[PDB]
Amino acid sequence: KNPKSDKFKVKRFHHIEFWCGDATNVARRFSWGLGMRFSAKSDLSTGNMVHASYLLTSGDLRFLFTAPYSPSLSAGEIKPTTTASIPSFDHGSCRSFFSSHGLGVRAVAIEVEDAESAFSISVANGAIPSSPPIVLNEAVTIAEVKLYGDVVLRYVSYKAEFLPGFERVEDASSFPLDYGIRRLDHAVGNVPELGPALTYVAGFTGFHQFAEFTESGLNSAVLASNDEMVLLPINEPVHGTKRKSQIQTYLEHNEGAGLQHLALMSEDIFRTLREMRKRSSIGGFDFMPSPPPTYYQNLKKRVGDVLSDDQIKECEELGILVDRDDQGTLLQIFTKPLGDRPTIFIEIIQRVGCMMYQSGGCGGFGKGNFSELFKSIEEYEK
Template sequence: MSTLDNTSLQLPKENLEAEDFLPLLGTDYVELYVGNAKQSAHYYMSAWGFQPVAYAGLETGLKDRVSYVLQQGKIRIMLTSPLKPGGDINKHIDSHGDGVKTIALWVDDATKSYKETVARGAESYLVPKTLQDDSGKVVVSGIHTYGETVHVFVERKDYHGVFLPGFKDWSPHYQPKDVGLKYVDHMVGNVGWNEMNKWCEFYAKVMGFAQLVSFDDKDISTEYTALMSKVMSNGNGRIKFPINEPADGRKKSQIEEYIEFYNGAGVQHMALATDNIIETVGSLRDRGVEFLTVPPSYYEELLDRVGEIDEDLVPLRELGILVDRDEEGYLLQIFTKPILDRPTMFIEIIQRKGAKSFGKGNFKALFEAIEREQESRGTL
């Protein structure tokens, strides 16, 4: 199984405007608070091909929660559920349903990362803390961001265990084949009316990010709904956070629907990268993952719009995969329907063939597909 390299890296700068004073080496893990971690783990293994890695709970000395850690490529997710009534995890689930609590960021120095960000105005979530066991030590710290989402800085260069101190190896008999997912490409946050610039400024001032691209309601709109979005990135380009806010439209936008059902700002979706989107999406569909669909007419003028591509149009059309091109290449992408009962979080699958953009040419087709789903839910 591929794991994150614990060695320090000096990565080339991709976003030249970013200060990158932390710096960030990558996404360490994403933690979701869920109602039933054991069953959620089975879903991510069976449907998404994640592999079992680590476990913490009653058997490891935890009394208030249980966590399962899964991995595919460089993507690690931790699923955490409460073991007793009351407390912050229960409150989070009651308010938001299942959802992302922690976006953990891999750093060389968690103490420095904490001091730098708090000094620039971040609200403290976790003061620097050393976790230790027979496999070494990990230093963690954390800050608050939009809604109840937090960033935890993870310094693990002196650790050689399975995940973090306090976790044990989890290797059940059932270990389904992966589907070719490689790494977290970007993670999108939905915030409330007129809050996008506030949180973009937060990432610029507090974390040294810079804006890669912005989209206004002329770029992201249909006959009925619209939204605004800006993409913030760190210097080496490994961490990209698009931030969305609602814009005025004739009907309720997907961002408004999300905020209503999530009860505030939060992570809308994770974009997971693959090297072969046709194989990955085919495998996911066979395992029961449901994707948004676009009309067949989308593909009639696709090659006129994006130019020559390596892939055959037939499987792209059959699977509903979208294509877009920018100055540096093209990308292929597809979006699931919400993967939870509440119409909140979904997952994007993306394959980049040189493109560094986010599929602007697909926005109209995508949003119309989302509106069809909203209409079926009675929330448009």
């Protein structure tokens, strides 16, 4: 059921911000590996003496890559006089974040109808504030509250192009890469305690529970906005098994709670993963090992309704996993970690079904794949 209990009007996922040591090199790496275009910049060349920020886009997917300059460049500035385009940026918070966590997501940004309203209500409903609502060039309002660990939920509202103080990137350095990725489907957090984190975040958003899982590694539950286009899974470790919890492994190397992965919807996961796998070893992203043939044999038994033999065969060529709900079918695959630490990674998905537009969360999140993976793996050893 859906109680539709949001405490403010939430529109959609807007952007994701990575805090980096060098924004250029991460952004250029992500651009090539994922097929996103360089579409906006705020830096020294735009008069920003505080931080370097570069935005990649694929469809409605926006990845923001931010790093601090030397504080010496903005030593004569104060917040009222700042040249930063992102007023919540802080040299010391950025360097502490990166030093503690390595490369990772700092902000999960959602568009709302009124960022100042959304901030006040949230804090009035238990959210720890992180940056109060600031109006940019009387056009855009932004505000931040704590989500989990050092990750912030960022509210954005527009009166009526990315942010003031950003510039459209010169056509020549903006090469129209595109491998089929269109928007952010969901963002998954890992915490030491799922209960308090669910209570906290549902407390100040009014987001409702969408799904849950539990017997191998984790417990999780998903919060969702009213129309369930903003989807926030949260995991916790389950201590006590033959294998160490990967959630727990995450928390160690990340120095605590943080964002685990971003699931990016592709309008054509076949072309997307062909393009990504072509580039895996020339600067792109690597992919988790592909399931055994066993798996893909059992898929004709599970989704032969949904995917032809040839489409199943293409799933096998590319290591794609398939789960099915009572309502939809989910094609999914995972990258290896995006940086040095085994912390953040990326998932590519495409959903089949739930036509009415397509309703969010169609097909679930893969909870059936745990079983079928081990079940198929027993059968490959044979």
